From Swiss-Prot, chain A:
Function: Component of the mitochondrial large ribosomal subunit (mt-LSU). Within the mitochondrial ribosomes, required to direct the nascent polypeptide toward the tunnel exit and position the exit at a distance from the membrane surface.
Protein name from the UniProt record: Large ribosomal subunit protein mL45
Family from the record: Belongs to the mitochondrion-specific ribosomal protein mL45 family.
GO MF: RNA binding; structural constituent of ribosome
A biological process term (GO) from this entry: mitochondrial translation
Subcellular location: Mitochondrion
Gene: MRPL45
GO cellular component: mitochondrial inner membrane; mitochondrial large ribosomal subunit; mitochondrion
Keywords: Mitochondrion, Ribonucleoprotein, Ribosomal protein, Transit peptide
Curated annotation (Swiss-Prot), chain B:
GO biological process: mitochondrial translation; translation
Keywords: Mitochondrion, Ribonucleoprotein, Ribosomal protein, Transit peptide
Membrane-crossing segments per the record: none
Classification lineage: Eukaryota, Metazoa, Chordata, Craniata, Vertebrata
Residues of the full protein shown: 41 to 206 of 206
Quaternary state and interactors: Component of the mitochondrial large ribosomal subunit (mt-LSU). Mature mammalian 55S mitochondrial ribosomes consist of a small (28S) and a large (39S) subunit. The 28S small subunit contains a 12S ribosomal RNA (12S mt-rRNA) and 30 different proteins. The 39S large subunit contains a 16S rRNA (16S mt-rRNA), a copy of mitochondrial valine transfer RNA (mt-tRNA(Val)), which plays an integral structural role, and 52 different proteins.
Name of this protein: Large ribosomal subunit protein uL22m
Swiss-Prot record, chain C:
Family designation: Belongs to the bacterial ribosomal protein bL17 family.
Pfam families in UniProt: Ribosomal_L17
Key words, A-Z: Mitochondrion, Ribonucleoprotein, Ribosomal protein, Transit peptide
Predominant location: mitochondrion
UniProt name for this protein: Large ribosomal subunit protein bL17m
The organism's place on the tree of life at top rank: Eukaryota
Annotated source species: Homo sapiens
Protein localization: Mitochondrion
GO cellular component, one term: mitochondrion
Tissue-wise expression: Detected in adrenal gland, mammary gland and adipose tissue.
NCBIfam families: L17
GO molecular function: protein domain specific binding; structural constituent of ribosome
UniProtKB/Swiss-Prot annotation, chain E:
One Gene Ontology term, aspect cellular component: mitochondrial inner membrane
Basic and acidic residues bias spans: 91-103
Species this protein is from: Homo sapiens
GO molecular function: RNA binding; structural constituent of ribosome
Keyword Electron transport tagged: no
GO BP term (any one): translation
Family: Belongs to the bacterial ribosomal protein bL32 family.
Post-translational modification comment from the UniProt entry: MRPL32 precursor is processed by the m-AAA protease (composed of AFG3L2 and SPG7), which cleaves the N-terminal transit peptide. Cleavage by the m-AAA protease takes place prior to assembly into the large subunit, an essential step for mitochondrial ribosome (mitoribosome) assembly. Proper processing by the m-AAA protease is dependent on the zinc-binding region within the tightly folded C-terminal domain of MRPL32: zinc-dependent folding halts degradation initiated from the N-terminus and triggers the release of mature MRPL32.
Gene behind this protein: MRPL32
Name of the molecule in the record: Large ribosomal subunit protein bL32m
Region called Disordered, residue ranges: 86-108
First-to-last residue of the parent protein present: 79 to 186 of 188
Amino acid sequence: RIKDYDANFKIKDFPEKAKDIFIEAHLCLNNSDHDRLHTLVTEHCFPDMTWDIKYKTVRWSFVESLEPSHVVQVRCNVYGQITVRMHTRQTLAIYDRFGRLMYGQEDVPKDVLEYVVFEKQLPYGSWRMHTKIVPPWAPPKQPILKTVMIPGPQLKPEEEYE
Amino acid sequence: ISRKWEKKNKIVYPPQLPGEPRRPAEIYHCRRQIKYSKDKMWYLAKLIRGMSIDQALAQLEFNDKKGAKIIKEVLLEAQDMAVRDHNVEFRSNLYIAESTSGRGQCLKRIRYHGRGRFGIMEKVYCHYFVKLVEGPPPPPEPPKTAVAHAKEYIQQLRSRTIVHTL
Amino acid sequence: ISHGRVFRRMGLGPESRIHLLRNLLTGLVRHERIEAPWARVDEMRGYAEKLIDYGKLGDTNERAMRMADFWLTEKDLIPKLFQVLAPRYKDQTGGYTRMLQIPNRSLDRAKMAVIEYKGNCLPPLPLPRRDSHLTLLNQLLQGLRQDLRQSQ
Amino acid sequence: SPTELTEMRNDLFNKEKARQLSLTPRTEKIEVKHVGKTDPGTVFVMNKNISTPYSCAMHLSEWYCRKSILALVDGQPWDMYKPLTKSCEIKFLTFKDCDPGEVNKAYWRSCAMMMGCVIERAFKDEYMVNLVRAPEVPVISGAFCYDVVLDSKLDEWMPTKENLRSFTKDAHALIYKDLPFETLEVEAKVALEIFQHSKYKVDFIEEKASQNPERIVKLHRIGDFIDVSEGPLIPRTSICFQYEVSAVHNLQPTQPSLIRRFQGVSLPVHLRAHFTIWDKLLERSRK
Amino acid sequence: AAPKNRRTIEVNRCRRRNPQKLIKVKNNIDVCPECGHLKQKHVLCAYCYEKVCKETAEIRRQIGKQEGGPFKAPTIETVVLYTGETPSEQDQGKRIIERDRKRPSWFT
Ligand SMILES: [Mg+2]
Ligand SMILES: [Mg+2]
Ligand SMILES: [Mg+2]
Ligand SMILES: [Zn+2]
């Protein structure tokens, strides 16, 4: 279906383009380039990437890809979604409004395995990141620097704790 | 109308260098168009000015003025947003750096007097502003001792010059 | 100058004061716990104690019956006064009422208090309790007491 | 020299702190649940070996920090500044609890430690002072006791009222300084390395290592003052409000050495006693 | 009498910021050991008092339902019994107010 709609697509050549799109989108997140983000990721992706990062600086950098990226699953007014498994190595450093580090290390690289789902709209559409599937068996993410308090039930006077 | 206080929370500072003191977090909050006189609100603002968040809440919970409840609600909202969005680790580790009351947009009404005469009432509204700064409240300025006071006097004496001469 | 004046000036006059106290005291007899402005509760506490004494006097006492009839505007409470409260306090000689200040009224920030007859069926008030005997200061004072007792 | 001894002891203490904190790199998250009566159900996701019950109190409110002297972690008492080591149940203990016994003991030990520091730093250089032990006397005794052996030159010297008042002044200077009670669980080997110049402290460390299954010992510092603690201590010296070195008594078995017991009495800010009650307490503590 | 001159903002600030005007800090506030909410030392805890008042309201509503009308105050003592509780020998001969909930821990 993808080939009958486009006539110049290559599944074998897709992974390099997908990796380039991913790197460019994350660099756009780093530089707060929403205009380029809207071209590199879908409208279902952009809010997920930007909402919680608003008012904070992210220092993201891709250092290397451990194993070559390769397509995994592809399905299809008509959209086509391609799942690409990438096991690469990246860096993070997220700071507060005040420039205080709150996640990751600016230099230490970390190995990340992820499944990026790209989508395309079938005249002027293109391939843009649509989602990231997180395996239920995914290793726990890096712990946060600051401690957290989770309030218990804010009991009303009549209510009693259980 | 001006709404710069709300925008003051949107300033993003550049990342701090590792060899730099940790910048205390600042959270600006406000409530607009409170049905309360700014003059009366000023007393509550002055009361809680410079105190820790918990102490301010404690005083406001037992002060009888109407504005006390409004200021308590504003402070609670400020604490919640400081924890959720401004990366403040501890709820209690906040102090009121700034607290002021501003004039709101008021409405003019007529008060009827005895002989067909009248006065112009003003349905007074006021704004309320708070800045919460992370960290323990700054120690109160200790009263200047006799030693320092005499030191200042002696410095004044030493500063004397032969005026109006070569 | 109000030297020695022991009665507050309440209501619209002396009669209105008596009637306000009477209504508060009837409510107290009915419910065994009433929250009302602090000054009014303070003024009515003595009258509550006096009704308890008059109920102790007994049903047959015509003077006590007349006092109860006047003070209890709801006549169903006179049998209560004479058969539930006075028998309850027969052992006691005084202090039938517990009065405790309450957070100020939300409406006008009035000083309020709760007054109850002791031993009522209602849930106990959050009474203020003295520090435990096991505190540091209390233990030191217990040591003082033991030393004095051993000396004597 | 005493200054050299203090400097090297503090250096060893700091190296031990650095080693302990480096033993657990990164930030491992431990869940500590507030099993206390009020604010029930609050679970704190703290940093392991870094966060403290004081950090828990800071998360809760300022009143917790001001009023909480001890922390029961999984049923055991903890210093408010002792880092937590695992997910657990936490309950803050104040002075005015129903059964303040543990808090009383901790305050009592802390007062004894402050007395020991004052004793060691009060005497002149030419006189040797060696702190032997802080007996765990009950509060009912009316006075916390600290045992010291002074120089043989002063075998017939008894402190005067002015000397006792100077000791109280030094203790109040410490209180004004308001130093935290830093704590560590350090192996008996390092404890002996720190206290190699005090046979009394060495043998006390040996007894503690024998009592506990491992060779772990509670080592506490107020400021530039390392000491062995029988148990948990209070957060900061500023907790103390009234503090008085009441008297000194020589122990009967004087033939081996003069064990002089400094007896004092104290009360925290939360339990201030009136002037007359305090005077009576001083009279009863002078015994 | 009318003002002879407008009082300046300096004089007005003096008058209205004189510490006699300013609100006084209250040092009698303390934490309630029961619920942990703030309370003035002499005043009863607001949270605990509200608990007691709501339980009292429920009990009084049950009392009214049992009475069934005005001027029907009982001539005997009253005892409140909760779910899973039976009258004791002392409770015998006393009007039983049944509450459809577990007895509160504070209530005894
Ligand atoms: Mg007219
Ligand atoms: Mg006007
Ligand atoms: Mg009047
Ligand atoms: Zn309470």
